[PDB]
Design a binder for this molecule. Structure first.
Ligand SMILES: [Fe+3]
Lengths: 77, 218, 162, 544, 102
């Protein structure tokens, strides 16, 4: 009877799909950057999440354009 | 609407390799086969704007679609491979690998003789139409040889092709009707541009680094 | 604080306190993720400011105290320890005690309007009064005396601050 | 192993690097003194030097003696130590012959442009495939300007000015909405957006450009501003920076080449470049396998995200069954609804007979049980009534118009007429099948035909693919057979099954007591079955 | 923003002409019909479907969005496609399963 699932929601009547999409995403993600470990890359990998709690900005311590594109060379050798 | 229209002229004259390949064969292979493909490639690209605005490598990789080739994968693949083939051959005989390439061949094959033997074996073993390639693998940082059926080229597996050969019959029948071993032996001994292969390896060295880093003593 | 926010687009400050830096922080406070103690700029309080206003106190519930004057603006740090006596725990008479201490210090010390440090040292008295008033059920029953408030002020704050 | 090999393995795999430790005087004194011992007179020169440096006046005296200023002494602490690389010199292979072609993805998705002008713009694509002899370039150069022909590129510039003047505020609004904070690789907005910048469609992979480095990130890489709302990105990873930091510095002007242009919404860095001018490629060893993307709140299906970002499919455990050799599917999905409406029709038609007065006065074709009847309210669970087993009773309410009662009424009239006729004969009347059951069988038959055609095409597809070497399964979907360990499945291979010491204890799990009990209640005497046969075999024997 | 047909490589030809229907033998294709039901199906091969009468909206596996096709559409389903098809009325189609090539 529950229609929260997208598969359960009928295509002709997508009210259940709209209600499911209206639900906000979870906060499980720590809102950071996924920093992989090369040490554990060969074996089962692990992840480090770098966020605003871990990284801080120190503060104030103290022409340019697409010139062109290269053309093919006749003397390719 | 028309992109990639140009028929790439070859780095050498159509009659430059006359002692070993007639002008006619090259004229037919290029004049007809190459032209045929590009004219259909621009016709297919005119229809779909999404595939229109893509690089040739990116276009090929997208049209491959991870095992299910799109109707535009073929033409593009063929044009690119034929172009590569034209560039991979020089008006001068090549019997020796260049200095950078040699070290790599010794590192993986172990000899130039074993490399040539494996190349000839793979070229003769492939049954039908296709191409054979000498490529550098980004993941393993090693040289290897790949045989691909029909129009497929290594770019689909994120590899850098250094040299390629047409095993489609249209390339060799007029000259040699049914001796593929000769056709190969000729391409290995007299008709191969190792300098172009070394240049492609030097270009790929930016993408894949073939060396060892400097470890500070600390 | 809640009343001042309600009079000053409470939803704006509610969205402000919930702001989190996406990539990296710009200060030490954001790195440690402590409770939000926002000090309102005089520009924000300008719509609620009139000519005849001498002092404006924005209490944060016996935990922070903000003062506003034509010359200077600031914030007095405070603390709450209702948990020390878990069983009684009644906050019913804290704000009344804070207002009473403020009025007492204003009637006794006449330099609070002109001097800022004296103002803060005197508001610490009202903070201590509220802290004492939160430990007893009954607003009229658990009201602090002057001696107890001075004792708590001297015990909580270092000698330099009192 | 040896210390050299271990250090090399650390540098290669774990990312070790001798980063400079900027210690305090007390920390340096602690690191230098602890080597000698505890409560022993310090005799090492560096230990005594640090002990004297623990005082500010000694540091001031040493600064005055060395002659350097205090600002110079502060920077002397932040000095790279160890071997310093030789300064790199730029080398050019030859003359750089360039062109100004319009990008191949100029028309933005959802923007309309003139087709006739679009063809003139795109005509440069076929012209770009003409070789030029680089060695004899200098002989043919003409120093007279104002005669160059760039009409196609100028018309492209006009059309691009139109689009940017149209969509500047829209792009800024979308950037403010989707992105909260500015980061190297994002659209410059607010104060940073000076007019005259080049939009993202203006660029294209293959265009040589020039810019200045604005930010240097350890993990992500170096960012170069090429005069646009989105900066450029050069992938330089963690461990290569220890040696690349002597050649790439903030504020340096470099020449870069665009390798791939992507979408800002789905990628953190839209444009990826390479450093032609510095040529630091000998240095780079750690590469990025896939481009960085944004995992946003709107994304709820991981497969759509993987398809959008071009990454491989989600890994799944590989089933050991072969899709080629498997039983075909004949069951039809509409069969359940057809059966339920058949039952509802039969029930309502039989109940109209029980109440002739109710059936009278109302046409069979037009009938209404309830005006506010809904299929949603019909679905319910009820386990109150249990004769032998208790389970939720799913209720389904067939619609009034859904049932066509005229055909059912005619069928029942004919059937009861033949029933009473056969009773007059003296034999019970029997009917093989009704109309709706035959229709359900036809549905099952057409579904079986569809499945058979699918499998017949699948056999040929297998051959074709195998012949040509093409893969049969989607690459990346079925990857790990056993690779993920510590997976409890009771297969006795990781020794997760109960010990094979007799297995006498079954009361804890998989107890077969209840089954034997209910079998003994149903059949107390478990005698040897004289006749044991399948249900379908018994039905056929009854038929045959 | 990009349509789901582009993501899942679902090629659909809307309002096909009579000459296009004459080609590929659309009249000689096998027929299939349904009422109101949910059909989970996995495409082991490419399938060319000409929906004649009804209307079908297909959702990808695990996706909260749908793709809708009308009676004037010629839809080709890609290989290894896992999706759910829902119908709400009489739906008649002509299906042809094709291997590598045409
Ligand atoms: Fe060819």
């Amino acid at each position: 009877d529950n229609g929260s699932d997208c598969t359960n929601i009928n295509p002709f009547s997508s009210i259940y799909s709209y209600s499911k999409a209206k639900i906000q995403q979870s906060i499980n993600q720590p809102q950071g950057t996924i920093h992989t470990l090369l040490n554990r890359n060969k074996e089962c990998q692990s992840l480090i999440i770098l966020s605003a709690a871990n990284c801080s900005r120190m503060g104030p311590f103290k022409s340019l354009g697409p010139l062109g594109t290269s053309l093919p060379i006749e003397n390719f050798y | 609407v028309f992109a990639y229209y140009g028929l790439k002229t070859p780095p050498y004259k159509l009659d430059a390799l006359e002692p070993y390949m007639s002008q006619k064969m090259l004229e037919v292979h290029w004049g007809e086969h190459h032209r045929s493909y590009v004219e259909a490639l621009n016709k297919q690209l005119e229809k779909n704007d999404i595939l229109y605005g893509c690089t040739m490598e990116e276009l090929i990789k997208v049209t491959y679609n991870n095992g299910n080739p799109l109707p535009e994968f073929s033409d593009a693949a063929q044009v690119w491979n034929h172009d590569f083939f034209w560039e991979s051959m020089q008006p001068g005989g090549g019997d020796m690998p260049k200095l950078g390439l040699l070290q790599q061949i010794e590192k993986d094959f172990g000899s130039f003789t074993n490399f040539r033997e494996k190349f000839t074996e793979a070229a003769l073993a492939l049954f039908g139409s296709g191409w054979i390639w000498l490529v550098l693998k980004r993941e393993e940082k090693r040289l290897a040889i790949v045989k691909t059926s029909n129009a497929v080229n290594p770019l689909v597996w994120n590899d850098i092709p250094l040299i390629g050969l047409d095993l489609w019959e249209h390339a060799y029948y007029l000259d040699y009707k049914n001796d593929k071993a000769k056709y190969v032996n000729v391409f290995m001994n007299h008709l191969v541009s190792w300098d172009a292969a070394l240049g492609r390896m030097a270009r790929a060295q930016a993408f894949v680094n073939l060396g060892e880093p400097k470890i500070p003593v600390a | 604080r809640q009343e001042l926010e309600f009079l000053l687009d409470e939803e704006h400050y509610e969205r402000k306190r919930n702001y989190r830096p996406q990539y990296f922080a710009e200060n030490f406070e954001q790195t440690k993720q402590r409770r939000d103690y926002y000090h309102y700029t005089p520009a924000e309080i300008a719509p609620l400011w009139h000519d005849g206003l001498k002092l404006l106190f924005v209490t944060d519930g016996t935990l922070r105290l903000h003062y506003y004057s034509p010359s200077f603006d600031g914030v007095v740090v405070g603390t709450e320890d209702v948990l020390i006596t878990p069983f009684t725990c009644d906050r019913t008479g804290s704000g009344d005690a804070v207002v009473a201490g403020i009025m007492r210090k204003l009637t006794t010390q006449p330099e609070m309007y002109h001097d800022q440090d004296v103002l803060e040292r005197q508001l610490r008295f009202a903070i201590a009064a509220g802290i004492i008033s939160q430990w007893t059920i009954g607003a009229v029953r658990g009201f602090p005396t002057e001696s107890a408030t001075q004792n708590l002020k001297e015990q909580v704050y270092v000698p330099s601050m009192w | 192993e040896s210390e050299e090999e271990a250090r090399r393995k650390n540098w290669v795999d774990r990312g070790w690097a001798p980063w400079e430790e900027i210690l305090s005087p007390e920390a340096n004194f602690a690191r230098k003194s602890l080597n000698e011992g505890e409560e022993v007179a310090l005799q090492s020169p560096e230990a005594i030097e640090a002990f004297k440096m623990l005082s500010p006046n000694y540091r001031k005296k040493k600064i005055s003696d060395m002659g350097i200023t205090e600002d110079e002494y502060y920077a002397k602490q932040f000095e790279i130590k160890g071997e310093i690389p030789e300064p790199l010199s730029t080398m050019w292979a030859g003359p750089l012959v360039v062109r100004h072609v319009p990008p191949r993805d100029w028309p933005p998705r959802g923007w309309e442009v003139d087709k006739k002008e679009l063809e003139f713009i795109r005509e440069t694509h076929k012209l770009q495939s003409v070789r030029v002899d680089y060695d004899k370039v200098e002989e043919m150069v003409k120093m007279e300007t104002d005669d160059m022909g760039l009409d196609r590129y100028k018309m492209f510039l006009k059309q691009y000015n139109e689009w940017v003047a149209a969509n500047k505020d829209r792009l800024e609004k979308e950037s403010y909405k989707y992105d909260q904070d500015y980061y190297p690789g994002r659209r410059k907005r607010g104060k940073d957006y000076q007019d005259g910048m080049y939009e993202l469609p203006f660029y294209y992979p293959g265009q040589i450009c020039a810019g200045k480095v604005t930010a240097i990130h350890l993990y992500q890489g170096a960012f170069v501003d090429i005069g646009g709302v989105h900066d450029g990105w050069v992938p330089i990873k963690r461990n290569d920076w220890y040696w690349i930091r002597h050649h790439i510095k903030v504020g340096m002007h470099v020449i870069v080449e665009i390798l791939a242009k992507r979408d800002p919404y789905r990628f953190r860095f839209p444009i990826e470049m390479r450093f032609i001018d510095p040529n630091i490629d000998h240095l780079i060893f750690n590469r990025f396998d896939f481009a960085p993307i944004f995992h946003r709140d709107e994304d709820t299906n991981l497969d759509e995200l993987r398809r959008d970002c071009g990454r491989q499919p989600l890994p799944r455990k590989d089933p050991g069954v072969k899709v080629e050799e498997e039983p075909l599917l004949s069951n039809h999905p509409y069969v359940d609804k057809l059966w339920q409406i058949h039952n509802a029709e039969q029930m309502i038609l039989d109940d109209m007979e029980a109440n002739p007065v109710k059936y009278k006065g109302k046409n069979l074709t037009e009938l209404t049980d309830d005006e506010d009847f809904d299929e949603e309210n019909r679905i319910e669970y009820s386990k109150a009534y249990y004769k032998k087993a208790l389970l939720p009773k799913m209720i389904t309410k067939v619609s009034v118009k859904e049932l066509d009662l005229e055909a059912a009424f005619a069928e029942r009239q004919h059937h009861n007429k033949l029933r009473m006729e056969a009773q007059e004969r003296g034999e019970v009347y029997k009917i093989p099948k009704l109309r709706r059951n035959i229709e359900m069988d036809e549905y099952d038959f057409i579904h079986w035909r569809r499945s058979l055609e699918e499998r017949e095409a699948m056999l040929r597809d297998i051959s074709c693919r195998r012949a040509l070497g093409l893969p049969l399964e989607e690459p990346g979907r079925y990857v790990d057979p056993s690779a993920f360990g510590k997976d409890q499945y009771d297969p006795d291979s990781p020794l997760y099954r109960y010990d094979y010491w007799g297995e006498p204890k079954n009361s804890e799990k998989s107890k077969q007591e209840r089954m034997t009990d209910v079998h003994n209640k149903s059949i107390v005497g478990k005698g040897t079955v004289w006749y044991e046969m399948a249900y379908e075999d018994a039905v056929k024997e009854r038929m045959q | 923003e990009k349509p789901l047909e582009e993501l899942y490589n679902v090629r659909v030809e809307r309002n096909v002409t009579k000459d296009r229907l004459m080609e590929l033998g659309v009249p000689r294709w096998s027929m299939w019909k349904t009422g109101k039901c949910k059909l989970p199906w996995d495409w082991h091969v490419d399938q060319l479907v000409y929906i004649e009468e009804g209307e079908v909206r297909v959702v990808p596996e695990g996706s909260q969005r749908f793709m809708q096709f009308v009676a004037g559409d010629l839809v080709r389903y890609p290989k290894w496609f896992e999706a759910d098809l829902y119908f709400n009325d009489f739906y008649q189609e002509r299906y042809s399963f094709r291997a590598y090539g045409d």
